[PDB]
């Protein structure tokens, strides 16, 4: 989860808004409609059609970014166990309570 | 069933080296029909075995629940 961002995310730079076709409308001075206005004339420009547009930019994979097992080290302050002793202790029983 | 554990191991160390010798072209369900050794699968247990089982098994009831059954038969039996 905390990876999945990094292709489809990009930090925003990355895959969306990646250079050249950021600006391809003019310079705006009609109207102060800045944002908005260039989202919606990318979403309608986006009429192209295509099909099984597969890539495997990945190391050994499809469509997806790879984790760095090293930012994967972040995950493990995060999760949670199930703490019991008295589980522990009850196990002492089940089993000839170890005795018999 | 250790006994026969042991046998079959040793039925399966024969079909590996079958296979081995040949061009391992056959499993062991395979081998049980192209080919039998009924001496061979008669397994006969040797004590060891049972020297081996006993050190592993638990009784089928702790002393509480012994106790308990032997008050109840003093009741109805020791009268």
Known sequence: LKSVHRWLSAADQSEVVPGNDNIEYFSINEHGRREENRLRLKTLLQQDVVHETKTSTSAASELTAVVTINDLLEACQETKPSISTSELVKLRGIYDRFQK | ?79
């Open chain 2, 1 to 79: 069933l250790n006994a026969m554990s042991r046998i079959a191991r040793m039925v399966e160390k024969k079909v590996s080296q079958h296979n081995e010798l040949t061009g391992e072209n056959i499993s062991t369900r395979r081998w049980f029909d192209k080919i039998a050794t009924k001496e061979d699968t008669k397994v006969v247990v040797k004590m060891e075995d049972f020297l081996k089982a006993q050190e592993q098994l638990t009784p089928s009831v702790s002393r509480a629940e012994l106790n308990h059954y032997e008050a109840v038969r003093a009741n109805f039996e020791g009268a």
